[PDB]
Design an enzyme around this catalytic site. Structure first.
Site, PDB file in Angstrom:
ATOM      1  N   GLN A   1     -47.544  -7.921  -6.875  1.00  0.00           N
ATOM      2  CA  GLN A   1     -47.791  -6.608  -6.291  1.00  0.00           C
ATOM      3  C   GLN A   1     -49.102  -6.137  -6.903  1.00  0.00           C
ATOM      4  OE1 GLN A   1     -45.808  -2.835  -7.499  1.00  0.00           O
ATOM      5  NE2 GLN A   1     -45.216  -2.592  -5.345  1.00  0.00           N
TER       6      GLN A   1
ATOM      7  N   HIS B   1     -45.463   5.157  -3.592  1.00  0.00           N
ATOM      8  CA  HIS B   1     -45.213   5.882  -4.828  1.00  0.00           C
ATOM      9  C   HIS B   1     -46.322   6.748  -5.424  1.00  0.00           C
ATOM     10  CE1 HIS B   1     -41.824   2.669  -5.475  1.00  0.00           C
ATOM     11  NE2 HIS B   1     -41.596   3.473  -4.451  1.00  0.00           N
TER      12      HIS B   1
ATOM     13  N   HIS C   1     -49.598  -2.384  -2.962  1.00  0.00           N
ATOM     14  CA  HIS C   1     -48.833  -1.214  -3.382  1.00  0.00           C
ATOM     15  C   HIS C   1     -49.389   0.027  -2.700  1.00  0.00           C
ATOM     16  CE1 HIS C   1     -46.323   1.465  -5.454  1.00  0.00           C
ATOM     17  NE2 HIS C   1     -46.361   0.950  -6.670  1.00  0.00           N
TER      18      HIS C   1
ATOM     19  N   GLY D   1     -33.924  -3.390  -7.804  1.00  0.00           N
ATOM     20  CA  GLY D   1     -34.740  -3.151  -8.974  1.00  0.00           C
ATOM     21  C   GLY D   1     -33.970  -3.223 -10.278  1.00  0.00           C
ATOM     22  N   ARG D   2     -33.341  -2.110 -10.639  1.00  0.00           N
ATOM     23  CA  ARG D   2     -32.598  -2.024 -11.883  1.00  0.00           C
ATOM     24  C   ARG D   2     -31.511  -3.073 -12.073  1.00  0.00           C
ATOM     25  NH1 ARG D   2     -32.242   4.368 -11.059  1.00  0.00           N
ATOM     26  NH2 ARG D   2     -32.138   3.493  -8.939  1.00  0.00           N
TER      27      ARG D   2
ATOM     28  N   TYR E   1     -49.639   6.182  -5.600  1.00  0.00           N
ATOM     29  CA  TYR E   1     -50.785   5.535  -6.213  1.00  0.00           C
ATOM     30  C   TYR E   1     -51.965   5.644  -5.246  1.00  0.00           C
ATOM     31  CZ  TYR E   1     -47.483   4.483  -9.764  1.00  0.00           C
ATOM     32  OH  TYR E   1     -46.537   4.664 -10.754  1.00  0.00           O
TER      33      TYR E   1
ATOM     34  N   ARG F   1     -46.025  -2.573   0.552  1.00  0.00           N
ATOM     35  CA  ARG F   1     -44.914  -1.682   0.249  1.00  0.00           C
ATOM     36  C   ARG F   1     -45.350  -0.245   0.501  1.00  0.00           C
ATOM     37  NH1 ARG F   1     -40.847  -0.849  -5.147  1.00  0.00           N
ATOM     38  NH2 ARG F   1     -39.024  -1.234  -3.824  1.00  0.00           N
TER      39      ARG F   1
HETATM   40  C1  LIG Z   1     -38.614   0.488 -14.921  1.00  0.00           C
HETATM   41  C2  LIG Z   1     -39.008   0.517 -13.468  1.00  0.00           C
HETATM   42  C3  LIG Z   1     -40.310   0.064 -13.075  1.00  0.00           C
HETATM   43  C4  LIG Z   1     -40.679   0.074 -11.677  1.00  0.00           C
HETATM   44  N1  LIG Z   1     -41.930  -0.392 -11.343  1.00  0.00           N
HETATM   45  C5  LIG Z   1     -42.353  -0.418 -10.035  1.00  0.00           C
HETATM   46  C6  LIG Z   1     -43.674  -0.938  -9.679  1.00  0.00           C
HETATM   47  O1  LIG Z   1     -44.528  -1.409 -10.424  1.00  0.00           O
HETATM   48  N2  LIG Z   1     -44.011  -0.902  -8.293  1.00  0.00           N
HETATM   49  C7  LIG Z   1     -43.116  -0.398  -7.322  1.00  0.00           C
HETATM   50  O2  LIG Z   1     -43.502  -0.429  -6.220  1.00  0.00           O
HETATM   51  N3  LIG Z   1     -41.925   0.057  -7.654  1.00  0.00           N
HETATM   52  C8  LIG Z   1     -41.490   0.074  -8.942  1.00  0.00           C
HETATM   53  N4  LIG Z   1     -40.215   0.554  -9.287  1.00  0.00           N
HETATM   54  C9  LIG Z   1     -39.346   0.976  -8.222  1.00  0.00           C
HETATM   55  C10 LIG Z   1     -38.445  -0.236  -7.935  1.00  0.00           C
HETATM   56  O3  LIG Z   1     -39.130  -1.319  -7.297  1.00  0.00           O
HETATM   57  C11 LIG Z   1     -37.273   0.171  -7.023  1.00  0.00           C
HETATM   58  O4  LIG Z   1     -37.785   0.543  -5.700  1.00  0.00           O
HETATM   59  C12 LIG Z   1     -36.378   1.250  -7.586  1.00  0.00           C
HETATM   60  O5  LIG Z   1     -35.964   0.908  -8.936  1.00  0.00           O
HETATM   61  C13 LIG Z   1     -35.154   1.583  -6.768  1.00  0.00           C
HETATM   62  O6  LIG Z   1     -34.318   0.426  -6.673  1.00  0.00           O
HETATM   63  P1  LIG Z   1     -33.009   0.229  -7.536  1.00  0.00           P
HETATM   64  O7  LIG Z   1     -32.091   1.393  -7.261  1.00  0.00           O
HETATM   65  O8  LIG Z   1     -32.421  -1.084  -6.920  1.00  0.00           O
HETATM   66  O9  LIG Z   1     -33.367   0.073  -8.983  1.00  0.00           O
HETATM   67  C14 LIG Z   1     -39.783   0.551 -10.659  1.00  0.00           C
HETATM   68  C15 LIG Z   1     -38.432   1.028 -11.149  1.00  0.00           C
HETATM   69  C16 LIG Z   1     -38.072   1.002 -12.478  1.00  0.00           C
HETATM   70  C17 LIG Z   1     -36.661   1.528 -12.771  1.00  0.00           C
HETATM   71  C1  LIG Z   2     -40.844   3.765 -11.491  1.00  0.00           C
HETATM   72  C2  LIG Z   2     -42.369   4.111 -11.195  1.00  0.00           C
HETATM   73  C3  LIG Z   2     -42.387   4.642  -9.763  1.00  0.00           C
HETATM   74  C4  LIG Z   2     -43.068   4.049  -8.764  1.00  0.00           C
HETATM   75  C5  LIG Z   2     -43.864   2.812  -9.007  1.00  0.00           C
HETATM   76  O1  LIG Z   2     -44.497   2.246  -8.115  1.00  0.00           O
HETATM   77  C6  LIG Z   2     -43.884   2.276 -10.356  1.00  0.00           C
HETATM   78  C7  LIG Z   2     -43.209   2.833 -11.409  1.00  0.00           C
HETATM   79  C8  LIG Z   2     -43.261   2.237 -12.783  1.00  0.00           C
HETATM   80  C9  LIG Z   2     -43.676   3.333 -13.797  1.00  0.00           C
HETATM   81  C10 LIG Z   2     -42.890   4.566 -13.718  1.00  0.00           C
HETATM   82  C11 LIG Z   2     -42.900   5.190 -12.221  1.00  0.00           C
HETATM   83  C12 LIG Z   2     -42.149   6.466 -12.175  1.00  0.00           C
HETATM   84  C13 LIG Z   2     -42.705   7.506 -13.218  1.00  0.00           C
HETATM   85  C14 LIG Z   2     -42.528   6.940 -14.634  1.00  0.00           C
HETATM   86  C15 LIG Z   2     -40.998   6.744 -15.010  1.00  0.00           C
HETATM   87  C16 LIG Z   2     -43.099   7.823 -15.751  1.00  0.00           C
HETATM   88  O2  LIG Z   2     -43.106   8.974 -15.813  1.00  0.00           O
HETATM   89  C17 LIG Z   2     -43.662   6.775 -16.781  1.00  0.00           C
HETATM   90  C18 LIG Z   2     -43.420   5.336 -16.264  1.00  0.00           C
HETATM   91  C19 LIG Z   2     -43.363   5.663 -14.731  1.00  0.00           C
END
Ligand SMILES: Cc1cc2nc3c(=O)[nH]c(=O)nc-3n(C[C@H](O)[C@H](O)[C@H](O)COP(=O)(O)O)c2cc1C
Ligand SMILES: C[C@]12C=CC(=O)C=C1CC[C@@H]1[C@@H]2CC[C@]2(C)C(=O)CC[C@@H]12
Length: 364
Positions: free
Chosen positions: A100, A184, A181, A323-324, A186, A233
């Site tokens: 990504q 979210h 990406h 994700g989680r 960005y 995405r």
């Molecule tokens: C620790 C953490 C880091 C994440 N990093 C990204 C990221 O880099 N790019 C992104 O598009 N989404 C990111 N997400 C969002 C996840 O891809 C996902 O859409 C979100 O956790 C909801 O799915 P879940 O309920 O299955 O965890 C992140 C979520 C968590 C909890």
């Molecule tokens: C989950 C998330 C969301 C969308 C995405 O694309 C990528 C990420 C990873 C980083 C977190 C962010 C959400 C905001 C977080 C929790 C903070 O306040 C610090 C680290 C950030």
């Protein structure tokens, strides 16, 4: 045993053996200086190689793209070499992985930007949120985001080119696919949303103008590699990191998707809600999206295996990115297949740190 989650699916240039995907997950464990992927990160991804498709944590297309300490990049020789070992590890286990790529835009801080200057965005408006940096001991810490500098018109071509170059690097690094990406809050989403985009040139205003940048990027990367290697995405419905989708989110979303469809890209990844609340997608909307995109569609956002089977069975989506659950279950595929219990999640170690809470969750 589930009905379809464990059935193959053609995703652009590759074929996934199952529809259980690992969502992109920022873990902030890269090496600094250099924002270099590590052997530990390699192990982490290798443990989850049974996923239908692994989507890597968000990765910088350039140094300017950096918004979090610990997030990896794919713009330098050192980074390319490190990623090559990671993709090789995944392939050694017969897995598939996509990188990504992002540019954080205003969700950044001047201290980690080149020259220590202000980060860039569509407009000079503070994201009014926080990002993650590391303290003197290398521990993750939250810090308010720096007010951004509005990108100059003649700087946009450079942004498109950084995406193009990163995709070229991704190809050499051994990645099977790339996921832009554009969600979210960005950079790409910053341009898409009227709440964060107040430009008066051709990159601001109408949805056509707001979507101009992302579409130029999509065209640039499709040309650099191949459309069947490209994924994107989006999170077009609801509010994320303070960036909403405007007064006509649904209509604007459908416009974007129709345009994306014209490029014939590999897949459309829909992040339905951010970690907090969010109005759920109506089947009517899922249908309108469905009929407008002819590639693979990935649903995401607090999904349950049951919901995945339901929507895939209704033919509304093709796969689901978890994700989680993937953070805590490397062999999530086998567990969902056998209907086994999952390992409990340890949220405190999602960001930063080391092996603990990373390569720590056992497989069956
Ligand atoms: C620790 C953490 C880091 C994440 N990093 C990204 C990221 O880099 N790019 C992104 O598009 N989404 C990111 N997400 C969002 C996840 O891809 C996902 O859409 C979100 O956790 C909801 O799915 P879940 O309920 O299955 O965890 C992140 C979520 C968590 C909890
Ligand atoms: C989950 C998330 C969301 C969308 C995405 O694309 C990528 C990420 C990873 C980083 C977190 C962010 C959400 C905001 C977080 C929790 C903070 O306040 C610090 C680290 C950030």
């Amino acid at each position: 045993s589930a009905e379809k989650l464990f059935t193959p699916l053609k995703v652009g240039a590759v074929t996934a053996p199952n529809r259980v995907f690992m969502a992109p997950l920022t873990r902030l464990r890269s090496i600094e200086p250099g924002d270099i992927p590590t052997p530990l990160m390699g192990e982490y991804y290798r443990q989850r190689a049974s996923a239908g498709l692994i989507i890597s944590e968000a990765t910088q297309i350039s140094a300017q793209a950096k918004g979090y300490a610990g997030a990896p990049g794919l713009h330098s020789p050192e980074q390319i070499a490190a990623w090559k070992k990671i993709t090789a590890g995944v392939h050694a286990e017969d897995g598939r992985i996509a990188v990504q790529l992002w540019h954080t835009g205003r969700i950044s801080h001047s201290s980690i930007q080149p020259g220590g200057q202000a980060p860039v965005s569509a407009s000079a408006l503070n994201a009014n949120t926080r990002t993650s940096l590391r303290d003197e001991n290398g521990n993750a810490i939250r810090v308010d985001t720096t007010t951004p500098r509005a990108l100059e018109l003649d700087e946009i071509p450079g942004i498109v080119n950084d995406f193009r170059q990163a995709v070229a690097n991704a190809r050499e690094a051994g990645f099977d696919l790339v996921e832009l990406h554009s969600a979210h809050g960005y950079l790409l989403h910053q341009f898409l949303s009227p709440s964060s985009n107040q430009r008066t040139d051709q990159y601001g205003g109408s949805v056509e103008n707001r979507a101009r940048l992302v579409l130029e990027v999509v065209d640039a990367v499709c040309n650099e590699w191949s459309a069947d290697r490209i994924g994107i995405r989006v999170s077009p419905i609801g509010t994320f990191q303070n960036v909403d989708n405007g007064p006509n989110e649904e209509a604007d979303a459908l416009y974007l998707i129709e345009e994306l469809a014209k490029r014939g890209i590999a897949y459309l990844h829909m992040s339905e809600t951010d970690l907090a609340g969010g109005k759920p997608y109506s089947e009517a909307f899922r249908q309108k999206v469905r009929e407008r995109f002819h590639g693979v569609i990935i649903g995401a956002g607090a999904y349950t295996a049951e919901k995945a089977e339901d929507l895939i069975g209704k033919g509304l989506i093709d796969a689901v990115a978890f994700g989680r659950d993937y953070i805590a279950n490397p062999d999530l595929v086998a567990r969902l297949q056998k209907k086994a219990e999952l390992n409990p999640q340890r949220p405190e170690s999602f960001y930063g740190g080391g092996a603990e809470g990373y390569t720590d969750y056992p497989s069956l």
